[PDB]
Design an enzyme around this catalytic site. Structure first.
Site, PDB file in Angstrom:
ATOM      1  N   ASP A 246      24.154   6.042   6.719  1.00 30.08           N
ATOM      2  CA  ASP A 246      24.176   5.325   7.919  1.00 30.08           C
ATOM      3  C   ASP A 246      22.871   5.290   8.956  1.00 30.08           C
ATOM      4  OD1 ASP A 246      25.957   4.212   9.830  1.00 30.08           O
ATOM      5  OD2 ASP A 246      25.808   5.999  11.124  1.00 30.08           O
TER       6      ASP A 246
ATOM      7  N   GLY B  77      25.522  11.789  23.547  1.00 26.45           N
ATOM      8  CA  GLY B  77      26.263  10.744  22.964  1.00 26.45           C
ATOM      9  C   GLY B  77      27.263  10.966  21.699  1.00 26.45           C
TER      10      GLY B  77
ATOM     11  N   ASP C  41      15.066   8.478  21.233  1.00 29.06           N
ATOM     12  CA  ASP C  41      15.783   7.996  19.979  1.00 29.06           C
ATOM     13  C   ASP C  41      14.739   6.555  19.674  1.00 29.06           C
ATOM     14  OD1 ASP C  41      18.917   6.945  21.156  1.00 29.06           O
ATOM     15  OD2 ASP C  41      17.192   5.555  21.263  1.00 29.06           O
TER      16      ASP C  41
HETATM   17  N1  LIG Z   1      19.904  10.067  26.449  1.00 29.80           N
HETATM   18  C1  LIG Z   1      18.925  10.579  26.808  1.00 29.80           C
HETATM   19  N2  LIG Z   1      18.864  11.516  27.525  1.00 29.80           N
HETATM   20  N3  LIG Z   1      17.613  10.176  26.101  1.00 29.80           N
HETATM   21  S1  LIG Z   1      17.631   9.236  24.750  1.00 29.80           S
HETATM   22  O1  LIG Z   1      18.789   8.213  25.069  1.00 29.80           O
HETATM   23  O2  LIG Z   1      16.428   8.923  24.405  1.00 29.80           O
HETATM   24  C2  LIG Z   1      17.836  10.621  23.407  1.00 29.80           C
HETATM   25  C3  LIG Z   1      17.455  11.739  23.741  1.00 29.80           C
HETATM   26  C4  LIG Z   1      17.727  12.785  22.708  1.00 29.80           C
HETATM   27  C5  LIG Z   1      18.384  12.406  21.496  1.00 29.80           C
HETATM   28  N4  LIG Z   1      18.679  13.255  20.770  1.00 29.80           N
HETATM   29  C6  LIG Z   1      19.516  13.346  19.524  1.00 29.80           C
HETATM   30  C7  LIG Z   1      19.678  14.385  18.792  1.00 29.80           C
HETATM   31  C8  LIG Z   1      18.600  15.419  18.674  1.00 29.80           C
HETATM   32  O3  LIG Z   1      17.716  15.823  19.298  1.00 29.80           O
HETATM   33  N5  LIG Z   1      18.892  16.180  17.318  1.00 29.80           N
HETATM   34  C9  LIG Z   1      19.912  15.450  16.806  1.00 29.80           C
HETATM   35  C10 LIG Z   1      20.568  16.042  15.443  1.00 29.80           C
HETATM   36  C11 LIG Z   1      21.685  15.315  15.031  1.00 29.80           C
HETATM   37  C12 LIG Z   1      22.279  14.208  15.932  1.00 29.80           C
HETATM   38  C13 LIG Z   1      21.616  13.747  17.109  1.00 29.80           C
HETATM   39  C14 LIG Z   1      20.513  14.437  17.500  1.00 29.80           C
HETATM   40  C15 LIG Z   1      19.140  11.041  21.614  1.00 29.80           C
HETATM   41  C16 LIG Z   1      18.872  10.178  22.552  1.00 29.80           C
END
Ligand SMILES: N=C(N)NS(=O)(=O)c1ccc(N/C=C2\C(=O)Nc3ccccc32)cc1
EC number: 2.7.11.22
Length: 281
Positions: free
Chosen positions: A120, A11, A79
């Site tokens: 944020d 993302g 998340d």
């Molecule tokens: N889209 C998927 N695969 N699953 S999810 O939507 O639950 C999802 C899965 C993992 C993450 N991880 C984001 C992040 C992570 O792991 N460490 C970070 C440090 C800084 C910014 C974002 C992150 C964010 C969303």
């Protein structure tokens, strides 16, 4: 960037795109962030690397190569936004909401003691694991370096440029309400709509409740006057301990709004535990 086998695009963020990536030399799975570079920024970021706590997503490495910047962070599987969506029909159990909120305040209390602000907070920056932990992501990137205004504090919207750690308390208060009601508290679609949504629930602020508010950059005497609503109508069915905590997190005056450290001692957390959630990964 050559040492990483990008798996998927996790993302886009306020400062760049994040990818789930696997380190070639080590095999470890990380969250790689390509920053969208000034000298100040490098130094800023480099302070964040040494900011370690169990509720802060760890900044592993900083790579400024070929005049490009990449941030390597620890990886968590889901998340809070996705987990909330998953639990929309049944809601998140109060015992879990209470644990997540207690952990988040501990993380904020740590950051705030080091003068670091997130600035944020949103469900998307809150990460959870299978063990029942919840962590803050993006901490400190705002300083070193369509958007959702839903969790923005009133003072930012009114033009205060020198805000404080109180802005994070406000955003957290907004997320606290959302987990309980399963609906966003103030979903504004522009800055003024956002502001007016806050005024219509909490009442239009004045010099009695918020001294100096009428001398703010963007305050207008022409702001409509709305009365304040019962919190009992705003966040049902949260008990009185929860509502009293929530009202302290949503105070207009930043100086009156509760600190993360004081919040941890509030009666609401007298019976906290650490339940393990059911996560479908
Ligand atoms: N889209 C998927 N695969 N699953 S999810 O939507 O639950 C999802 C899965 C993992 C993450 N991880 C984001 C992040 C992570 O792991 N460490 C970070 C440090 C800084 C910014 C974002 C992150 C964010 C969303």
């Amino acid at each position: 960037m050559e040492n990483f086998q990008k798996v998927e695009k996790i993302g886009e963020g306020t400062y760049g795109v994040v990818y789930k990536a696997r380190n070639k030399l080590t095999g470890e799975v990380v969250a790689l962030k390509k920053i969208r570079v000034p000298s100040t920024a490098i130094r800023e970021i480099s302070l964040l690397k040494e900011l370690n706590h169990p509720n802060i997503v760890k900044l592993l490495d900083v790579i400024h190569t070929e005049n490009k910047l990449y941030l390597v962070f620890e990886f968590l599987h889901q998340d809070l936004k996705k987990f909330m969506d998953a639990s929309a029909l049944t809601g998140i159990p109060l015992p879990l909401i209470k644990s997540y909120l207690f952990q988040l305040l501990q993380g904020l209390a740590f950051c705030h003691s080091h003068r670091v602000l997130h600035r944020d907070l949103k469900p998307q920056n809150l990460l959870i694991n299978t063990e029942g932990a919840i962590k803050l992501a993006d901490f400190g990137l705002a300083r070193a370096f369509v958007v959702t205004l839903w969790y923005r504090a009133p003072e930012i919207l009114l033009g205060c440029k020198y805000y404080s750690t109180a802005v994070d308390i406000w955003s957290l208060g907004c997320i606290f309400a959302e987990m309980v009601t399963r609906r966003a508290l103030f979903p504004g679609d522009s800055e003024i709509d956002q502001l007016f949504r806050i005024f219509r629930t909490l009442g239009t602020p004045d010099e009695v409740v918020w001294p100096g508010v009428t001398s703010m950059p963007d305050y207008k005497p022409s702001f409509p006057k709305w009365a304040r609503q019962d919190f009992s109508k705003v966040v049902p069915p949260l008990d009185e301990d929860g509502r009293s905590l929530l009202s302290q997190m949503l105070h207009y005056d930043p100086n009156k709004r509760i600190s993360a450290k004081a919040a941890l001692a509030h009666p609401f957390f007298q019976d906290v535990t650490k339940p393990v959630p059911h996560l479908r990964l």
